[PDB]
Amino acid sequence: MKTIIINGVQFNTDEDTTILKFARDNNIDISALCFLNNCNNDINKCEICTVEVEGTGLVTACDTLIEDGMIINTNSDAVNEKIKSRISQLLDIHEFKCGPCNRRENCEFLKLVIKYKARASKPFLPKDKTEYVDERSKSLTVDRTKCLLCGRCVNACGKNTETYAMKFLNKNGKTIIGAEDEKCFDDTNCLLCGQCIIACPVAALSEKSHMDRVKNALNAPEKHVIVAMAPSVRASIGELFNMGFGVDVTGKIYTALRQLGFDKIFDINFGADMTIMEEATELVQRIENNGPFPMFTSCCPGWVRQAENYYPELLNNLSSAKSPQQIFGTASKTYYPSISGLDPKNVFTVTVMPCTSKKFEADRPQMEKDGLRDIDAVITTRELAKMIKDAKIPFAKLEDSEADPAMGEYSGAGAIFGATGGVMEAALRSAKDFAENAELEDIEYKQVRGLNGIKEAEVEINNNKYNVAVINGASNLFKFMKSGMINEKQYHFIEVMACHGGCVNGGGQPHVNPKDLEKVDIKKVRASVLYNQDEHLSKRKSHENTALVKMYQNYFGKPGEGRAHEILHFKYKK
Numbered sequence: 001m002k003t004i005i006i007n008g009v010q011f012n013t014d015e016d017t018t019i020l021k022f023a024r025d026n027n028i029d030i031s032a033l034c035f036l037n038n039c040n041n042d043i044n045k046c047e048i049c050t051v052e053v054e055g056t057g058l059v060t061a062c063d064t065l066i067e068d069g070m071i072i073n074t075n076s077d078a079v080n081e082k083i084k085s086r087i088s089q090l091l092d093i094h095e096f097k098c099g100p101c102n103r104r105e106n107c108e109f110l111k112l113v114i115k116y117k118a119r120a121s122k123p124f125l126p127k128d129k130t131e132y133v134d135e136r137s138k139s140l141t142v143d144r145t146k147c148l149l150c151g152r153c154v155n156a157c158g159k160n161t162e163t164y165a166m167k168f169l170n171k172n173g174k175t176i177i178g179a180e181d182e183k184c185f186d187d188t189n190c191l192l193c194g195q196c197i198i199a200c201p202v203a204a205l206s207e208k209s210h211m212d213r214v215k216n217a218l219n220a221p222e223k224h225v226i227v228a229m230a231p232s233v234r235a236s237i238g239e240l241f242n243m244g245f246g247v248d249v250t251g252k253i254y255t256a257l258r259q260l261g262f263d264k265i266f267d268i269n270f271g272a273d274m275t276i277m278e279e280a281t282e283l284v285q286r287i288e289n290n291g292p293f294p295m296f297t298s299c300c301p302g303w304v305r306q307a308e309n310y311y312p313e314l315l316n317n318l319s320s321a322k323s324p325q326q327i328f329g330t331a332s333k334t335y336y337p338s339i340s341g342l343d344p345k346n347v348f349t350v351t352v353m354p355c356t357s358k359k360f361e362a363d364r365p366q367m368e369k370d371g372l373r374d375i376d377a378v379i380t381t382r383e384l385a386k387m388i389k390d391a392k393i394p395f396a397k398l399e400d401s402e403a404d405p406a407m408g409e410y411s412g413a414g415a416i417f418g419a420t421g422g423v424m425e426a427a428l429r430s431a432k433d434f435a436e437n438a439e440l441e442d443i444e445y446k447q448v449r450g451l452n453g454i455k456e457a458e459v460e461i462n463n464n465k466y467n468v469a470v471i472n473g474a475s476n477l478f479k480f481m482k483s484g485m486i487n488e489k490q491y492h493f494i495e496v497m498a499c500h501g502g503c504v505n506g507g508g509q510p511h512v513n514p515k516d517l518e519k520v521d522i523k524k525v526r527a528s529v530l531y532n533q534d535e536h537l538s539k540r541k542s543h544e545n546t547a548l549v550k551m552y553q554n555y556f557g558k559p560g561e562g563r564a565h566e567i568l569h570f571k572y573k574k
């Protein structure tokens with residue numbers, strides 16, 4: 001029993017832990033800023049977690065271990081004035097104009113300024129932002145008038161991806177963050193996964209806006225504007241409307257989209273089922289052809305960039321199926337006209353994604369046919385929330401509506417795509433029926449679910465054994481390759497997601513404050529929505545999607561051949 005005193009209350013504990021963590025454990029208020037992902041900003045520590053230890057002085061609670069005999073005061077005048085001082089110093093480098101700011105409603109810094117009634121010694125009022133802003137990327141943007149130089153993005157990049165594509169740079173004698181050599185991120189090894197954005201406490205890192213593309217298309221009378229959301233959006237956007245965590249808001253989204261004026265409400269889960277039709281078919285062909293193995297998924301553009309940038313020799317092993325977004329988009333410019341009378345050139349296709357890398361994918365030059373882009377705009381979950389709020393739509397009390405079914409129906413296999421191992425599970429449900437010419441009732445592959453960084457399973461397909469792996473996060477791809485794990489056995493099919501937890505933890509998702517992250521397992525809670533959908537859907541195999549089956553039978557023919565192979569696939573040369 002360590003005996004410690006905090007603010008004159010006695011605690012007895014066997015724990016070995018920091019002052020911050022014990023304080024959070026025991027409902028004692030200590031502020032923190034740079035501490036995230038189980039670090040601090042090791043050079044240039046923020047000191048916002050300052051406390052007083054009697055007999056020692058002011059210490060940073062986030063990395064100071066409790067010890068027997070400790071007497072700690074978290075709220076003395078000397079403590080508070082130190083913290084207020086540090087915040088004041090940050091205000092001197094911060095353009096404090098919250099009105100038009102994209103983090104106005106959930107900013108960690110604003111909360112601290114209010115809490116400590118901090119004041120700049122000199123307001124920072126840059127009158128040329130162009131010098132502080134980098135909007136070159138198709139996916140990320142930087143506004144250094146907001147940057148606290150807290151290093152959370154640098155550490156998050158390193159931990160989540162191990163690319164270290166986000167760096168501290170010396171620019172003109174001054175420290176900034178940015179890409180290697182202050183290049184555009186896209187021109188570096190960066191995956192464009194946005195985990196750096198998710199780690200940022202302020203509006204310094206953001207997604208590259210596609211809001212003007214959307215606005216202009218909705219305002220163009222001749223454009224017919226389709227919208228379709230990713231699996232994960234329905235499991236997360238409610239967080240930005242005060243509804244809490246793990247709330248299924250699918251039906252409210254469809255209603256909001258109609259109120260925003262979109263012409264057709266479809267769903268990327270339909271594209272997920274399409275990807276499975278193509279990719280399960282391809283896997284069966286590879287089985288019949290004795291390879292080449294392994295086949296890797298190709299639906300995560302962060303992973304595609306990782307392969308391009310670090311494992312180009314694996315590109316010909318990637319599934320040729322387009323991702324759900326791009327396969328959907330392709331069909332929206334071909335099949336959808338065929339059942340509507342729309343001129344394909346007037347269809348404008350918008351997706352809503354939990355992802356920043358999806359904007360790069362959509363903008364890839366060859367992701368088009370007959371001069372028509374597969375996908376014309378990609379907005380993140382955050383961008384859609386802003387749109388809904390700007391339109392004054394009372395989201396939390398909307399009535400549910402349904403999608404337009406022709407490219408809107410989805411199976412429970414497509415529904416689970418947004419969680420790590422979801423693609424794998426979905427794919428196996430169709431590949432085993434396909435390979436065995438059977439309709440199997442046993443379809444749950446729990447072995448590939450959950451938050452382990454690398455997962456594996458042995459699957460029997462048509463009386464032979466196959467090995468599959470699920471790589472959960474870009475850093476785990478590096479581990480899997482570098483460790484040689486990939487050689488313990490012949491792998492046949494491998495899912496890779498760049499974001500840990502899969503797309504539910506993508507870089508376009510709602511920010512979560514670090515204290516909530518401490519009490520809510522965001523990856524699991526968001527994923528649970530998706531798995532619950534699967535449990536209640538009447539179709540749980542992609543090839544049982546009735547609108548999809550109609551689409552292949554009337555328009556595309558059989559997967560992996562004919563029209564489908566010719567326009568629903570994409571291969572990477574580099």
Ligand code: SF4
Binds near residue numbers: 097108146202
């Ligand atoms: S980053 Fe935060 S404190 Fe700074 S202007 Fe935006 S909302 Fe205000």
Ligand code: SF4
Binds near residue numbers: 165
């Ligand atoms: S987008 Fe991903 S890889 Fe690039 S700097 Fe951010 S966290 Fe690192």
Ligand code: SF4
Binds near residue numbers: 148150177200
């Ligand atoms: S961009 Fe954001 S996370 Fe990175 S150092 Fe600046 S304030 Fe911190």
Ligand code: SF4
Binds near residue numbers: 299356357
């Ligand atoms: S895991 Fe999903 S959100 Fe993350 S980069 Fe890949 S596609 Fe995007």
Ligand code: FES
Binds near residue numbers: 048050
């Ligand atoms: S939160 Fe402890 S030094 Fe930054």
